[PDB]
Swiss-Prot record, chains A, B, C, D, E:
Effect of C68A: Impairs inactivation of ligand-gated anion channel activity by sulfhydryl-reactive agents
Topology Cytoplasmic: residue spans: 1-30, 82-236
Name recorded for this polypeptide: Bestrophin-1
Auto-inhibitory segment as annotated region, ranges: 345-376
Binding-site positions, Ca(2+): A9, Q292, N295, D300, D303
Effect of I204T: In RP50; reduced channel activity
Organism: Homo sapiens
Effect of R91C: In VMD2; loss of cloride and bicarbonate conductance; does not affect protein homooligomerization
Interval of the full protein contained in this chain: 2 to 377 of 585
Assigned protein family: Belongs to the anion channel-forming bestrophin (TC 1.A.46) family. Calcium-sensitive chloride channel subfamily.
Amino acid sequence: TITYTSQVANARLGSFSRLLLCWRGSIYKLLYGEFLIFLLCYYIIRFIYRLALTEEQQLMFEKLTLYCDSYIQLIPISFVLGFYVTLVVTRWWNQYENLPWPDRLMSLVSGFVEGKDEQGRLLRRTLIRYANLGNVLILRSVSTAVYKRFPSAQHLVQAGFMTPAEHKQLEKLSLPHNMFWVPWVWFANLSMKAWLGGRIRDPILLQSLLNEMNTLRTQCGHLYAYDWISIPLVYTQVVTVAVYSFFLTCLVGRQFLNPAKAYPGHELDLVVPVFTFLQFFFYVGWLKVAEQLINPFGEDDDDFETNWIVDRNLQVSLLAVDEMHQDLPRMEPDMYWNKPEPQPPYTAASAQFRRASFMGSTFNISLNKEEMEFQP
Amino acid sequence: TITYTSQVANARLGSFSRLLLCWRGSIYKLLYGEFLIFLLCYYIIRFIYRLALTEEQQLMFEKLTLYCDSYIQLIPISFVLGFYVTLVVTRWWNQYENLPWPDRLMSLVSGFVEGKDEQGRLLRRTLIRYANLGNVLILRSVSTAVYKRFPSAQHLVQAGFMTPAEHKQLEKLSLPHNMFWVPWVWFANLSMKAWLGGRIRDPILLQSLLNEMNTLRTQCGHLYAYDWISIPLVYTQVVTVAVYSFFLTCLVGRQFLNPAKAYPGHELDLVVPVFTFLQFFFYVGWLKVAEQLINPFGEDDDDFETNWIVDRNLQVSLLAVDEMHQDLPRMEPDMYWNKPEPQPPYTAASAQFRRASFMGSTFNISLNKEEMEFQP
Amino acid sequence: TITYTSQVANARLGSFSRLLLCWRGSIYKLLYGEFLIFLLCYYIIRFIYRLALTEEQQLMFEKLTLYCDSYIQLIPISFVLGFYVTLVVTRWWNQYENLPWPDRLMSLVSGFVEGKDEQGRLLRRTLIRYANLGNVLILRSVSTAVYKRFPSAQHLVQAGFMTPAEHKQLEKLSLPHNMFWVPWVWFANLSMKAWLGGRIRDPILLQSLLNEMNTLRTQCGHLYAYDWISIPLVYTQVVTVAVYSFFLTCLVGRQFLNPAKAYPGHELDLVVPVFTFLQFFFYVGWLKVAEQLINPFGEDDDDFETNWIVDRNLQVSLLAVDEMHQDLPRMEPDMYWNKPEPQPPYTAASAQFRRASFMGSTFNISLNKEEMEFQP
Amino acid sequence: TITYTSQVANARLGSFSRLLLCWRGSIYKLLYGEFLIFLLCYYIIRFIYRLALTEEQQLMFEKLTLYCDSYIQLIPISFVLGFYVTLVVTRWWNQYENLPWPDRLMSLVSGFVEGKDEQGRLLRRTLIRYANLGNVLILRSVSTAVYKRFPSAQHLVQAGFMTPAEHKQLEKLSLPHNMFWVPWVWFANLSMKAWLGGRIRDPILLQSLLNEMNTLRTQCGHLYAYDWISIPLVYTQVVTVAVYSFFLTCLVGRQFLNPAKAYPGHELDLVVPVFTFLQFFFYVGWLKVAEQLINPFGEDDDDFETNWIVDRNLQVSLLAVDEMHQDLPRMEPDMYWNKPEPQPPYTAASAQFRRASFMGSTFNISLNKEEMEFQP
Amino acid sequence: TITYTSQVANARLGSFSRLLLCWRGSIYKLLYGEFLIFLLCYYIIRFIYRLALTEEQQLMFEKLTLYCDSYIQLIPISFVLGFYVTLVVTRWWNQYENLPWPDRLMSLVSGFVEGKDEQGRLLRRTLIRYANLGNVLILRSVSTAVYKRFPSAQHLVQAGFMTPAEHKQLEKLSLPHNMFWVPWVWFANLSMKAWLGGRIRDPILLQSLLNEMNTLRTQCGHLYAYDWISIPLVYTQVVTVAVYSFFLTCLVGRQFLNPAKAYPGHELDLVVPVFTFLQFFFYVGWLKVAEQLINPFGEDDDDFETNWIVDRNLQVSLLAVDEMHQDLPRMEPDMYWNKPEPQPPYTAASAQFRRASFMGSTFNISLNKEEMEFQP
């Protein structure tokens, strides 16, 4: 993902203006090809009109150029694009929110499941690795960036996400459906067995682990649903038909006619129509926003770093459930042990950030003494 | 459902342009009939004006064509369609989200309910089959694709969703309402009996099963509500009246008059009005989006595959609660058993997907030493 | 509520076109009176201009007709109506979602509360009847369709929702507020007493019952809030002022002047202005959508069937907690008892609905062998 | 709050038309002053142009009037107002939803905390009074209607919301922040002490009370956040600049020039410009909607009745936790004790409200016998 | 944050008009620089046209000015800005809601964890300080206002948020990722150890503490996600391109030509174009709204006071868990101890705020006696 949050931290002189100089993930890279095709078509038509067309043919073309320009509607094209792009952006953010993070589950698994011995170490590692396996199984089906990393289930075995025994078990259970739901059932069975084995003292704790596990299951199901149930094809087709019909119309209607005839609005001849290219950039970039955001799991530049997400999740989970289990910093009295009102200091650069506490909007209301007395 | 997610993975040269070549679930199949009716009416009126109308009649028709075109409003028609289609799409996605998936319930039922013997096997299978029966009972009432598969309750018995004893019990309880709520009460009673029978050791576990059961109940209730409380008929009628009045106006106002009279804007005569057909395609396809999405449980091409959902749910549920119960892969140390920092390898195709971790937008801010010192 | 879901199941030839033939709950019944008033005013003004006005008066009227038409703005009127109607529809759906259904509570009450004897039967019936009483108490205050059925609290006693002892107790507790909150406190006290009496074995179960009870309490509170805090009166007044000012302007500006003067745009005289009536139908029907949906608990035709909801709720609750308690269908092995992969059959009409399972958007990506190898 | 729900129950002949006769909370009272200022300025400018300006000055003014009118843009002003007013209304409804109601907490406190003796009575009363104190502490900081009732913390002591011991304790804990968070910590400590004292038998019940307590804490925090983090000042300034610039332009551009010069569109002179006042009413009322709704806790007429909310909450809480604790209506068999299907009667006025149950949209689908047979 | 809630409490005469006099956080400070640049460019072009351009050059410039003005589109620019600014504002409010407040956690920690001795004091303080440390760790990565206060992890040690032992432990666990997730795992381990140590009597209480802890974890994860996954760069670039292209067009098209040529619309020459500056203020301020709100954690004036939030959180948490633990106000009978209906008095200023209780919209419906009788 292209992150520019640091650049737009402050609303300064042209803070968004500086963003026009970015290339990666920009509108520039998305539509240079379409812009070049538009230029080629426009200049080909212009040269044909200038040279090949005879006087009567030029007159007929002139009438068409006049007719096409009047039709050029775009309050409707803005309407359709705005409702669509809003839909696409909302779905894109929901897709990101439904990404499963094992941080709530890994904390619980680190805490509840007991045993410093090798058995407890193995139990905790496998319990968190089942969640990671479910996440990677859904991601390699939803994203083309993770599929290229794990083309087949043997690649998951080679990468350490799946042990060979789990691979054999998953093959034995094979059904004509996506198998991303198996690890959650494995986790439920293993945690139940752990509770029966004494590793989890009180069942309330087992219920807590399952709830943080089924929340991950729901998030993965939402990812699968967003992958499967795409934005309706008819709506995308309507939007692209509108945009491309607009610009095919502009190919003729925005043509600069012969100044000799002196048609209204064509008095001056310029070699390039700046506004049509500017309208092209604006409208086609608006379409490209939805085009890039419609599938955020691809391998574009503004698409999510799903590979990094997978790697992080595995690393932090295996660290928390194994080395951080019952290894805590020495508990010592704070700096503010006997200070009733902790006031951490401010750096010189951050001195101005000190503000008085907001006590509510009614703090500054002034009343007379007669106004403040109670009535019977 | 028409899935094109793989095609639009990357914002490439005309990625949406390639979607205009699709037929199934497209705008093409939805509105070819209306387009043909529009063509027939337009050419009939054109031929009548050319031939049947006399000179005074042609003059009166010309005035009408001029008058109708000026009225042709569409910033309002775009407004009404955009607010409606947004409503329809939001309701469509909510309807999909309210589809019940037994994956959270089946994991719990596989884990908690104990017994490898035939009694436990039967208990788990019936507990999950009650949830599947509730789901199919609501779906055959909400969707015309599942009703054609189970026209009567005897078809549910023949398909294995309902045992004959359950069919008799459901007939005995008959009330003048939809009976989709019976299986949830059956599930509650059966799980309570199982807890009294020792199959579920600690009640906390019974509470967990009921919560995952009542969430499914709420989802099914939302499906029934969306089926019953449709989008208001007045709002749909207003939208279709707007669109069809627009195009009935365009039938006359967009007519190409006699070039001999040389009216303003009718200097050149073309046999086909490309813009009116393009506006027809755009606006009628915008209407068809809402028309197709208003009832997503039909048997269109972009409607949900409810039959496949039912079949999957039954298969995966009966697999998880029966064969996967207390059958777990052999627990063995991982590939990363003694590696502090797991770093799974990258394929050659996926090498570029490796990214540095994002440490926050303030990581790159630089400060002087005097700026970094604390103040008293 | 007017349900047309079956009619719009398939996007067929004019599926919305067939909805224009409906009368009940339609735009036709909503605005025929306003349309007739508009016709009467328009023709009265037309006759006055034709006859009563003298030549100078007719000239002054002509100038006014010309002036009024130019002002006729409606991109703004569409804007205001669209933002409002969206607000009204969102609130309408939220109001429906906040309707309380005792299905989650009745399942729990049927399961947890024990005793086949008359004492347990009475306890379960009263526990669910308290929830039904709370629901009807909020509904008779929020809806004018249920108030006409229970005008006074004695009608609730006569209808069986309230026993005379409960009526006396509710009268004794009388406060100058709506008393819809009493049954929830009664339910809490009664369930606590039942747990102390041994009818509910383990408190976890009592906590489950209370949570499903307080969710109903929150839903009823939301209904009361939606009834009390209406859409701001200023916003409704602004919308209606806009619409009615528009059409009062159209009463003069859209008048067909004398063709003899040959004003621009008034060359041809027609007795009826079709577009003004079409704009009237569109805009006034758009207003009527919000007008009908602003209070969905009235007794219109598209308003919710609150009386039916109350009756159903009572019937299904009293059935589930009394006859269905610990009465379960005989537990027998399924049709798929030894079939590893259940495949329910398909009817001849539903054969085409069989689809292959979606395995994810990356299933069809093809890679070379060199692309699939891991890198060091 | 101005409640007109009863008036708009039915979509009848001019149901919204009758709302134009309301004064309190109307657009009439909100903008009469601005309308009078606009009238005064418009007539002052008109008189200056008629009298003070000489012939050349009048000609220059005429040119300006012509120039200003053309600029008069308002599709943009509608756009900005619509996006803003939608934001303001959404925030207003969220602010109302975040109002804390102790009804869920008071039911639990009435049920769980045991003891008919004076100790239990005092314990329950103080437990619910802590929640009421937290609610009033946040409300007197968020609303200017409650601050005028409790200007100082001594007023809370005098009104019974705070005992003198609690006032002393709150003063002793004083920090330079809003102290609305203290009562929740007091409640947690007191409920923990009650559980240690035997008043709450099983901790599950203590967890239930705390959850209903922390939900209230979250709602109060949201109220404080909505008070503190207002809608951005820049966005409000942009909207008001747009509206007021529009109407300052209309002060000159909409001026009725001398008919003697016979400018286009100024042929007829009227003393009052009805459309400009109508556009003024529409646009300024649209702005006043957001202006009134931006702070719903003031003391306007459509602002929330926070004082009544506080009084109700205290009354119902102290009633439920004290007199209604373990005082239940006599449990007796229902009217429907032996009736399998309860059918409550209908009044004569409500007879038409009886409807047949909706069995789903697929109930009426008809199939042939060959269509209904299963296929191998 | 700029708080003006007190100023807009009442919809009074020009309540928003008074907001135009504010400077801090206003549109004035945001766009004075861009306005000055626009003025300089406009006057430079005007002087060049007046002086440097010759008669033929002036004629060509005049034609360009005429051509540019006609293109000046802005219904589209309003559309794009409105959809964007709505997106930015929604994300801004979600970012604020995801701010973690330890108030729910600190109440639980104060209540449940037992021990007045130094061991319990230390345990409670460290448990709440872990949550505060997680919050500050995410905030110093998400906000540039907190990073300037804690440039390095040693600053957290010096400020008391992190003890040296925790700093050493965090360094030992170092991974190439953001380490904001460590304190939650530390909290889980420490609370588990406390439960094993007897400080937390019943595990249900441990489950409650973890749930309030993982909710904070989810909120911090959402903050990190909002920081990392910014609004797509292509969409921001499209919006700024639209706005700046509009105003570059206005630099020429809105130029006041020579009145001597007497072009249509340029009859009168004014030195300043008021409308272009007014359109500049409106559109650029609309853009500046999103520009300021895109990163609400900067150190602007309307950005959140994250430093104050951090300081408050630490102070109130350390106060509640340490001094307020098992220190409760003396429990005494209320003022309303024997009053059945508490009626707190009203001040003289607040007398008018007394309102009658709303009993529902159907309270005032009147029915005849025949209407009120039940039917068989």
